[model samples]
Target: SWGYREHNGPIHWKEFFPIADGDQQSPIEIKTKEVKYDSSLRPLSIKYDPSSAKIISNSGHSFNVDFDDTENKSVLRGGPLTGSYRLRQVHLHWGSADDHGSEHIVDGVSYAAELHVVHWNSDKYPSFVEAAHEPDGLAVLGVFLQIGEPNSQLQKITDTLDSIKEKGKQTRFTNFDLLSLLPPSWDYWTYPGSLTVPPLLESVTWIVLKQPINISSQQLAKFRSLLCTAEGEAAAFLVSNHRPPQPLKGRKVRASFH
Candidate 1:
């Protein structure tokens, strides 16, 4: 169906999903001068259990590392959220080249890639599916990935890539130090937006980090090697899978740091 290919990509998404044209779309440009610094934003509170991660699979779009969210073992709190937002999965978005892959651009600069840590408001919704339909029921922490030295924390994920090279392929993936992948400074920009993917649900409270973690060029190329086509089908690599920034439409982006 919908994909990153020229005909089925972002610009053509509105044909099927009308919400793609909604005012609250995601992956907006983050202009530092336009961002308002709020003193009231609390420091983000994150607690993740390594055992919570169960599997990693290629969804033809991105590789998703799902966690056991049956309980509050791994959750995100504070920093624009009213209650506990249980961790559901972690995924990445990248491009064919290193210079401009990140979905969110800051001050006219784009990083090599981006990481999304998806969570749902367990206090208000029973599950992630339910949360995706509400206004204040989902939270996603976005971390920008720049090309630099190899990140040790990211190695755990890269090591499993070969096993899940094709679409829908999955393997047991656990004990990953998800928190360690984040930059030391937890400073971030907060806004209300929708999911970058189809269905294009506008139920997310976006918390995009300021400092980016590093990933070697070799590691990034491996991500591009992943297949968009599944077994028994003509193989096609997923070279680029990031959405371009949408219109801001009067949305006020807040900063957690001054």
Candidate 2:
């Protein structure tokens, strides 16, 4: 298992998996002229049921809601897609400074943060990592977080941050709900890409929500408490741990409701 550490951080993820790295990568600055939106697209249902979410921490890089056959009841349907895809995992990307956050940039602007809801095609695959290996393997629902009013979704999880104050700490949080945290709107941009991690699996279809979520500056302070070092140390080692912008590699980005 790999953990995001000093030299082993996202900047060096390319060394581990060369194919998905390099100058030509995804989650690049979105070009509006390169695409068209179809009004026929419909929004997928988003709900909150805390009983279904299980909180898991991976070396403090993230706090995720894990979903397998037993955890989530969410299934995406309609729009420019069709299939029974199952929710796999949810992770985040943040900036080093409170004023800035997010791994992917949009036409040269970086939001406060980003959230990824990973889903896999259950009809053809059984595992998320396995599906990430193919070009059509994974679908990531992206959410942007901008500084503004206090974020209600984030407030719900702040209490759980204390549980993962230590490095490599994992806890079972039943009160977690995968849906409760989602911003109300569903307008989104869809594209083809790979995992942001080292493997950089080229098989991902990305769906980036158009609207940004509201997270006040004070609320973001909680995320800064996450451990970034190897051992369970103090917060000095904790800071923004996001990847720099990657090249577009000529991939096309389209919005469903453009």
Candidate 3:
């Protein structure tokens, strides 16, 4: 199985899923100089309902905060997307240390962590599962997490860590002001890419925010405490859960802001 460990991590992912070496892999280096400012890109339109957040669970890969996708209570539109992209879940990626963890690097810099708000093309696809298989069927909002003051919104998620210390554990989590978690600016750089994990599906229109959210070291440390192993299985800390940057392959990255 492919994991972030040295033994079975990304380096060996191609052994099982050949797509791991595909032309449009994700978490690519975002060179600010090379990014083109596209006036055609519409401003981001987002509407998130607090009650739409249902539960938070440890998927053994990352803590997935699943949303109520039955309705378009929370959705992302505009900004390179033709129609509505319904929110399905939000997950995080980080390293064993706080110095470097973000999947996408900007101008040769890596943030402390990164947050992925995964959504599917509700307008074109019937469901997230179905959307995951097609091009232009998914839109993932990427928010970089910098080391700084604590974030209250993130604190709510961190509070659930103890209950879900091991994998396969979940707790009722709702009323999340997910919008408040976003940075002040919606400026972003976007491109086409695939999922960073297994089944590395190439269906995502990656929208990576320019501004970064803040998270204190203490809060980030809690993320590392999460175990990759399930309860009753041999315990293993998920110290690192991030994929390195892949090739650009002549893809043009568009910037929403001038």
Candidate 4:
């Protein structure tokens, strides 16, 4: 599989998935100076039920928090998206150290980590899988993390790390306050991009928050403790799990606030 190791990491991804080099690739650099303020973009509307959180898993790539998406209880609306997008899962990407990890770089600087809240267009597609291939199929909210005082909101996730130390490991997790994890302000830069991982579908409408949340260095260390290998296989620490910034390819990045 595509682990972030020496031989199978990001650089080798294009070998198996040709779309990795596509024009609308993700994890792009958000140059503050080049951003255009758009009057037409609507403020993001997110409604999430704490009871929607269902399970947590280590899928050999990263630790993911799954949610119950059977209905409209947890949904994302407005912003650059046209219809209702259902919250599916939440995941994080971090680096070997505290200085760099976030996938989307702001003014050529990297954050300590990145949090992705993945949503899909329930109004247009039958499911997340079918929606993932369409141009406007997915919407991902990216929140950057800075090293500071410990975040109480992050503790709930770190507490579950031990339960899923190995790949394919999963545990019951619920009642999560995912909304509280976001920064106070929703100011963001919106653009067309693709999935940061393999299959690299160019279907995501990326909304990267300008404000960053806080997390202590100790809390991030817990994420690195996860193994990239499944049990019964050779173990390898997942020290880093972030893709670097991709080429913009002449796309306009619209800002929600000036």
lDDT of each: 0.95, 0.68, 0.94, 0.94
RMSD of each: 0.6, 2.8, 0.7, 0.6
Which number leads on lDDT? 1
Residues 133-201 of candidate 2 have per-residue lDDT tens digits of: 666667778888898889776755677777776666667766665565667778877766667766666
Clashing residue pairs found in predicted model 3:
none
TM-score of each prediction: 0.99, 0.86, 0.99, 0.99
Which residue pairs clash within candidate 4?
none
Quality of model 3 by C-alpha lDDT? 0.94
Which candidate, 2 or 4, would have the higher TM-score against the true structure?
Answer: 4
Clashes by residue pair, model 1: none
Per-residue lDDT over 1-258 for candidate 4, one digit per residue giving the tens place of the 0 to 100 score:
887999999999999999988899998998889898999988799999999999999988899999887788999999998989999999999999999999999888899999999999999999999999999999999999999999999888898999999999999999999999999999999999999999899999999999999999999999999999989988899999999988998987889998
- Please provide, for model 3 over 140-177, each residue's C-alpha lDDT reduced to its tens digit, 9 standing for 90 to 100: 99999999998988978998999999989999999988
Model 2: lowest-lDDT 10 consecutive positions: 229-238
lDDT tens string, model 1, 193-236? Answer: 99999989999999999999999999999999899999999998
Assess candidate 2 and give its lDDT.
0.68
